[PDB]
Design a protein around this ligand. Sequence first.
Ligand SMILES: Nc1ncnc2c1ncn2[C@@H]1O[C@@H]2COP(=O)(O)O[C@H]3[C@@H](O)[C@H](n4cnc5c(N)ncnc54)O[C@@H]3COP(=O)(O)O[C@H]2[C@H]1O
Ligand SMILES: Nc1ncnc2c1ncn2[C@@H]1O[C@@H]2COP(=O)(O)O[C@H]3[C@@H](O)[C@H](n4cnc5c(N)ncnc54)O[C@@H]3COP(=O)(O)O[C@H]2[C@H]1O
Ligand SMILES: Nc1ncnc2c1ncn2[C@@H]1O[C@@H]2COP(=O)(O)O[C@H]3[C@@H](O)[C@H](n4cnc5c(N)ncnc54)O[C@@H]3COP(=O)(O)O[C@H]2[C@H]1O
Ligand SMILES: Nc1ncnc2c1ncn2[C@@H]1O[C@@H]2COP(=O)(O)O[C@H]3[C@@H](O)[C@H](n4cnc5c(N)ncnc54)O[C@@H]3COP(=O)(O)O[C@H]2[C@H]1O
Lengths: 106, 113, 103
Amino acid sequence: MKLIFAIVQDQDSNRLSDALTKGNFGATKLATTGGFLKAGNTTFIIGTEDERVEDALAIIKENCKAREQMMTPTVDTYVPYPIEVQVGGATVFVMPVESFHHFLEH
Amino acid sequence: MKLIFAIVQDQDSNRLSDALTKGNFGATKLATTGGFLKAGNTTFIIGTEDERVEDALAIIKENCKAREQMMTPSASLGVTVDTYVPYPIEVQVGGATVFVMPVESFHHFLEHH
Amino acid sequence: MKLIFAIVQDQDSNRLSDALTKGNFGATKLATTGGFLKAGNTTFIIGTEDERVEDALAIIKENCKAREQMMTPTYVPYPIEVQVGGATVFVMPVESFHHFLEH
Ligand SMILES: Nc1ncnc2c1ncn2[C@@H]1O[C@@H]2COP(=O)(O)O[C@H]3[C@@H](O)[C@H](n4cnc5c(N)ncnc54)O[C@@H]3COP(=O)(O)O[C@H]2[C@H]1O
Ligand SMILES: Nc1ncnc2c1ncn2[C@@H]1O[C@@H]2COP(=O)(O)O[C@H]3[C@@H](O)[C@H](n4cnc5c(N)ncnc54)O[C@@H]3COP(=O)(O)O[C@H]2[C@H]1O
Ligand SMILES: Nc1ncnc2c1ncn2[C@@H]1O[C@@H]2COP(=O)(O)O[C@H]3[C@@H](O)[C@H](n4cnc5c(N)ncnc54)O[C@@H]3COP(=O)(O)O[C@H]2[C@H]1O
Ligand SMILES: Nc1ncnc2c1ncn2[C@@H]1O[C@@H]2COP(=O)(O)O[C@H]3[C@@H](O)[C@H](n4cnc5c(N)ncnc54)O[C@@H]3COP(=O)(O)O[C@H]2[C@H]1O
């Protein structure tokens, strides 16, 4: 089993989430911020069997888009130039799981 | 050492945190949402020595209970002038979903000025 | 590749973020809560190449400081402290890494 951490842009979050659900993947969503832009993005945690990892990755790839994102921004004052930063569709880490439990006690 | 990621219901979050502390397990948590119900839940990150893993899992099992949760009803627009309350759709939610991950190395940095 | 989870105090978060960037490391941050003090802190997730793990750990150690924090709850008691570390750090193995760049 593997635990996938996928850091995606907020604009793709809902589409990805719906696609993972359609593909019968469980997932948990975390609100995160990037080290460089210091702005909101989204991290998904997706646990799955080894044999289904490439399927999950394909869903991520197909639902996330690389974009340019704007970064939060003399005698004479000038209007500052926007700062446009390349942001990938997804940064993904696939981690090994030692054991899984689903506790259903009442 | 292992690093446990446990996704639990909000209703159990305070009770689990208290039980971990009483059991001398460290823990960090964060508010998360579920991909299916799109509702708030909590994710715990609990680092533990190998000897203690079964004790940590026991605490999680004991303090995190399965419940039925309502699915948010359809937001589809009607014409009737009303608040419409359809049959509830109840969804099973487990006590905890838990991933135990192997740790390669551990550091606790205590530098001052 | 390895994936570092580093739990640091909020007052070190911006400095750490900047030092990682200066060191050519990527990072993601989670706003978290500690179990014992029940107070806000920051969890960094920093993925890096095997051979650079010790360099990332150095940046973390260098930029995060241990601080004393007071315990809180008919009176304000004689203060009792705990020493919050600069960082609690777990280095985790990564089976695979992907960076999807389709637009
Ligand atoms: N000097 C520099 N240092 C770092 N980034 C710079 C940069 N100059 C430009 N960039 C760009 O800034 C984008 C957003 O970085 P941010 O840290 O906010 O948001 C990141 C961060 O949240 C996460 N991420 C990327 N690398 C990571 C890593 N090694 N560990 C953990 N999270 C990472 O994925 C998000 C998107 O990363 P991506 O590389 O696609 O997109 C990056 C990168 O292309
Ligand atoms: N009873 C047992 N059951 C299963 N495995 C065992 C074990 N005793 C030793 N090991 C294995 O040997 C490693 C070194 O144990 P040690 O006791 O020298 O070094 C231990 C111990 O000195 C320390 N430690 C601190 N507080 C502890 C506590 N409450 N319980 C267990 N270990 C603790 O944490 C160190 C690292 O623990 P970690 O599990 O990463 O690494 C452990 C574990 O992989
Ligand atoms: N078609 C469907 N797809 C997904 N779930 C459906 C479903 N039909 C019913 N369910 C139920 O919805 C419950 C809540 O899922 P949610 O994704 O909001 O909240 C989840 C999610 O936050 C997390 N989780 C579950 N499996 C996951 C995985 N493989 N990876 C990451 N997080 C997971 O644990 C929470 C509770 O999960 P649990 O399985 O006990 O409980 C699930 C499951 O029993
Ligand atoms: N049972 C106990 N008795 C006496 N003193 C205790 C105690 N548990 C914690 N402390 C003290 O309280 C400080 C803050 O812990 P807290 O859980 O709020 O904040 C923690 C928590 O967010 C995280 N952390 C610590 N151990 C962890 C673990 N095993 N798993 C996950 N996160 C951990 O790192 C933060 C800083 O931990 P650090 O150890 O440097 O600093 C700790 C330690 O000085």
